[PDB]
Design a protein around this ligand. Sequence first.
Ligand SMILES: Nc1nc2c(ncn2[C@@H]2O[C@H](COP(=O)(O)OP(=O)(O)OP(=O)(O)O)[C@@H](O)[C@H]2O)c(=O)[nH]1
Ligand SMILES: Cc1cc2nc3c(=O)[nH]c(=O)nc-3n(C[C@H](O)[C@H](O)[C@H](O)COP(=O)(O)O)c2cc1C
Ligand SMILES: [Ca+2]
Ligand SMILES: [Ca+2]
Ligand SMILES: [Mg+2]
Length: 320
Amino acid sequence: AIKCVVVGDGAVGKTCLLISYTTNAFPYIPTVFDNYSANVMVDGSTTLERIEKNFVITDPRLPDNPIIFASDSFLQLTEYSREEILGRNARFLQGPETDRATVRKIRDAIDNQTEVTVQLINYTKSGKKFWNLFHLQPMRDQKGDVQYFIGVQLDGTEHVRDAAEREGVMLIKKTAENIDEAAKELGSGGKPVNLGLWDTAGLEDYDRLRPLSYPQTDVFLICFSLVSPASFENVRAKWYPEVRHHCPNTPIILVGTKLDLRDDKDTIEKLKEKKLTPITYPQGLAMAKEIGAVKYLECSALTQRGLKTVFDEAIRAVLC
Ligand SMILES: Nc1nc2c(ncn2[C@@H]2O[C@H](COP(=O)(O)OP(=O)(O)OP(=O)(O)O)[C@@H](O)[C@H]2O)c(=O)[nH]1
Ligand SMILES: Cc1cc2nc3c(=O)[nH]c(=O)nc-3n(C[C@H](O)[C@H](O)[C@H](O)COP(=O)(O)O)c2cc1C
Ligand SMILES: [Ca+2]
Ligand SMILES: [Ca+2]
Ligand SMILES: [Mg+2]
């Protein structure tokens, strides 16, 4: 259950983006307060990415058994970027002092599709030497055929022995099972996440009752209108200081609404008569970086363009 509070000036599209996202419709009635709760399915569009351990996943059905997934932790350890290793066999980690007889035991485990737990010397991208308490585990489908391979690494400085060895093997095995369950859950479509949408009033008259819905907030949506420079300036002048006055460390996502009007003839003409111009993307991006927003997203409640990405990043900011 995630609570999401949407704040911003009057008539910028706060209520419309909530209704269009929950009921696929489109309404002007100044909202005092309204609740909205919709079930969102997190399908990586995950719990597998939240696992902060050194592990990778490969595909034995593809030539040379390439890496199809690599954790953030694995990237920080091996000093490799994702694009550099995604799709390549994990043998690049090996080097001169790497015991080849141990590598053979790994090869036999993959060929026979079994589990294996070994210790070997691997190398980072810059050539940093470290011991690897490595555990390999095949991931079978519902039929019983091996679909993937899980490789869990426990980096160290020396070759662990006795109790230290027994402790480490225990950890990487328990870790592998967690990954295995996280992978199966991903294929099933993950778990449904209840999203609480709290619509607030933008009028100045409701400035006193508005912070009453701020407690227990997991993520804020500060909205402004792309065709209203006044609402854009209010983000720095009003909405950001107000949110931070009650919620000092709550994830804020800046949202530019009414995207379909930025490329509208009559709309731009209306703004030119008042000597104004629609808010541009770098302008909106500079505002998000200034107020420390985790993401800047533009959307249209009317055409639903970028509308789903807004609430997807809202959830992602909470789960990550
Ligand atoms: N073309 C276009 N118009 C929009 C869009 N979203 C909102 N509008 C218009 O802007 C007006 C603002 O709608 P609301 O969502 O009710 O305004 P609000 O942000 O909720 O402001 P408050 O009700 O005071 O809190 C609506 O009457 C729509 O006509 C959009 O995505 N595209
Ligand atoms: C999922 C998975 C993860 C692996 N992780 C490592 C690793 O971290 N370090 C390493 O030296 N080898 C790792 N290996 C083994 C190598 O990718 C490779 O299979 C092994 O070196 C044998 O290669 P070869 O058959 O060409 O001799 C992993 C293998 C798999 C399937
Ligand atoms: Ca079979
Ligand atoms: Ca008044
Ligand atoms: Mg409203």
